[PDB]
Please model this.
Amino acid sequence: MAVLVEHVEGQRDLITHKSIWHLSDAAIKNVYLFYMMFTCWGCCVFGAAKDPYYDSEQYRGDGGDGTGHWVYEKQEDIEEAGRAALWREELIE
Amino acid sequence: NPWLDLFYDGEDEPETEYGSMFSDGKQDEDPYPRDNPENPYGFLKFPQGYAVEMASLGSKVRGDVRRCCCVVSGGVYDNLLFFPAIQLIKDRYPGVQIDIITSARGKQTYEMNKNVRWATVYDLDDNFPDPAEYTDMLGLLKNRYYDMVLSTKLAGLGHAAFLFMTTARDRVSYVYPNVNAAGAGLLLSETFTPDSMNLSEG
Model:
């Protein structure tokens, strides 16, 4: 039963054990269901957690807002603000 | 030249008045439209008869500019020598915002300028630019809605077309003194022919 012995002349005989096994579709659905609940639990828990960098002053103080283009816009803004500050200083004087 | 502007009918008569409002003075003198704090809906105070949209009237009648684009070629020296022109634009047109297009080296010159709003780096010396970068720069210029664009770079047909697609009311440029600038003046509002193939020789 599920064991086959082959003899070859001039060669060592081979004993092969075989077991055609597969996961049931119910087991696969259970894996999917548990991973979905794990994803929901992790989303809740690690959203409730604190974010070390995105809540820090190193990110928000520089002008970060979660938007991918804040660095270039902040750079152009500070150059324009420097030029406007020179214009203000020349107006006052 | 008659075949280009058919039905010319000469220039304007000396007795033409161009209306009453937005006719004379400068940009900072316009009294209308003014604030109406007594209006329950926030509508402004408009003159009798005149249409509500009046900010477009100054460009057509008085030729006002509010955003100007100076595409300055060269490095630090040329962009530095363009400072009196920028001050002249600021003095002639009060409240104007002047944006500069220049090379990487020339962009650092406008750190010490009080009149420039945006300074942008663009490889003007490349005659065969990247299509994506060229299209992005052209769309940026189109979306800034410049009233007038000036070009110190000697403009051939390609640079004239690039200035043409800017949707600017005034397109002013220096052109090549040779025969290769033929047809560039058709796409430009005003053309200047320098005394040499190098503008920095002056």
User: Anything to note?
Assistant: The interface with chain B takes residues 76, 79-80, 82-84, 86-87, 90 of chain A (CB under 8 Å).
